């Protein structure tokens with residue numbers, strides 16, 4: 001009943017059967033005959049002989065007295081890897097995820113061989129939760145450190161979690177059978193009940209239509225729990241501790257849906273918010289009243305169903321300039337659409353806008369490049385009259401705010417006769433200082449119950465302006 005094993009492809013640690021004819025406490029003498037000629041003097045069963053890759057052996061055993069029918073051979077062997085050992089297991093309770101780190105002792109293992117790690121996670125010694133398999137190679141017999149994490153489906157607070165690990169080493173050039181290592185000694189992480197919250201998780205957020213479980217630690221029996229008028233069966237974890245699985249979570253209200261666990265005397269609970277990420281900002285356009293600042297207005301799409309301290313946030317970043325601007329919003333006192341302001345940079349005249357949107361569930365973006373000039377929108381004129389030199393027609397003078405000393409206009413002036421006709425004419429004027437302007441007409445009918453009206457334009461092509469206060473100051477008719 002002999003047997004040979006090995007943990008390094010280098011040495012074979014054999015151990016034969018019991019005694020045939022001699023009693024207990026006998027010494028032994030074994031020899032190994034292949035090509036060499038070395039013998040041994042043993043006191044037990046094991047022998048630990050050098051490993052023979054390709055080649056046969058000839059093993060002679062003697063009982064050391066009252067002899068011995070002991071003769072056998074050796075070719076392959078049986079490969080049992082050195083039981084791995086967990087380096088350090090830790091948790092991030094906020095995200096309720098596990099961190100494992102161990103070191104394959106590749107260093108004490110010769111050839112580049114492939115290895116199979118198997119990680120196992122139990123929630124209570126018994127129940128099995130995740131089962132991982134990664135495959136790789138014993139890196140040039142160097143100790144290589146491995147990392148593995150997992151975000152539990154249940155909060156790490158309301159149940160103990162053990163984690164073991166073992167491996168399989170397949171060496172392409174080994175002939176013996178290759179068995180699995182032992183399971184790494186157990187490494188567990190349990191939370192010490194030390195808080196106010198007994199219900200997990202607190203005030204989380206999830207994509208509507210997802211699945212989620214809720215913890216509840218306690219020392220007094222839990223009678224029942226419900227989401228919203230719902231009453232979920234109780235999953236019985238370990239000391240009158242309870243869990244509840246929830247499926248296809250539905251859109252929460254402005255205030256997150258509630259989850260209450262209830263006991264004999266008291267009641268506990270948390271809240272949950274199910275919404276959507278933000279929609280890609282639709283209809284992103286940036287115009288300009290004056291060539292000083294830009295107005296990028298946009299409209300959000302689907303309502304995130306998340307508001308308040310988790311209302312979707314917007315940020316306008318400029319490509320080259322690098323300047324940005326994160327608009328903070330009131331708690332929805334805006335209506336549907338909203339905009340933001342971006343001060344023009346001197347000597348730019350082209351902006352590569354990208355409106356960013358953030359949300360505790362997702363992010364979106366809509367970018368729009370522009371020639372600020374081609375996108376100008378003048379504000380309506382102000383405070384103008386109708387006076388001139390003595391004769392002929394009238395010389396108008398209008399006031400329009402901003403900075404346009406650089407370009408020209410196409411302010412079309414409409415002249416309306418005595419409640420009948422209205423021909424059209426336009427005179428071009430350059431940009432002046434932050435002040436009024438001075439135009440001109442030609443040969444107009446003195447009085448004749450005439451009326452005026454004005455609307456502008458720009459050298460660049462875009463929106464016109466709001467009409468101004470309609471005036472009808474008839475100069476002199478009889479003298």
Ligand SMILES: *[C@H]1O[C@H](CO[C@H]2O[C@@H](C)[C@@H](O)[C@@H](O)[C@@H]2O)[C@@H](O[C@@H]2O[C@H](CO)[C@@H](O[C@@H]3O[C@H](CO)[C@@H](O)[C@H](O)[C@@H]3O)[C@H](O)[C@H]2NC(C)=O)[C@H](O)[C@H]1NC(C)=O
Nearest residue numbers: 317318319320322351352353354355356365366367368369
């Ligand atoms: C304003 O528009 C520009 C467009 O101009 C750029 O277009 C890109 C595609 C490239 O040819 C670049 O040379 C032009 O200037 C937006 O450009 C964004 O550029 C970044 C570069 O970091 C792109 O991301 C990159 O993507 C590659 C592979 O996809 C990665 O390897 C890089 O690491 C990097 O992540 C990005 O796709 C471009 N944006 C989009 C979505 O078009 C620019 O983003 C925008 N203004 C800003 C700053 O937001």
Ligand SMILES: *[C@@H]1O[C@H](CO[C@@H]2O[C@@H](C)[C@@H](O)[C@@H](O)[C@@H]2O)[C@@H](O[C@@H]2O[C@H](CO)[C@@H](O)[C@H](O)[C@H]2NC(C)=O)[C@H](O)[C@H]1NC(C)=O
Nearest residue numbers: 207208209210211228230246247248249250251252253274
């Ligand atoms: C998740 O639920 C929806 C339907 O939700 C409904 O409205 C809720 C507010 C609540 O009152 C629920 O009880 C209601 O049932 C499921 O939608 C159906 O999905 C099937 C396919 O799965 C589809 O054929 C039907 O047309 C859908 N019905 C409609 C219009 O809602 C959805 O299936 C559930 N989640 C999953 C993945 O099964």
Ligand SMILES: *[C@@H]1O[C@H](CO)[C@@H](O[C@@H]2O[C@H](CO)[C@@H](O)[C@H](O)[C@H]2NC(C)=O)[C@H](O)[C@H]1NC(C)=O
Nearest residue numbers: 002003004005072073074075076077078176177
């Ligand atoms: C490797 O070597 C020994 C040598 O005895 C193996 O024993 C042989 O096993 C095979 C398969 O069972 C048989 O066909 C042979 O008859 C056995 N002996 C001979 C002739 O060599 C042993 O099973 C192998 N593995 C171990 C445990 O080392």
Ligand SMILES: *[C@@H]1O[C@H](CO)[C@@H](O[C@@H]2O[C@H](CO)[C@@H](O)[C@H](O)[C@H]2NC(C)=O)[C@H](O)[C@H]1NC(C)=O
Nearest residue numbers: 348349350370371372373374406407459460461
């Ligand atoms: C930004 O837009 C303006 C308007 O298109 C550009 O200025 C014009 O440039 C063209 C050359 O293609 C000239 O013919 C026009 O006379 C210019 N407009 C006027 C009258 O001011 C400007 O070049 C654009 N920015 C850049 C450099 O791409």
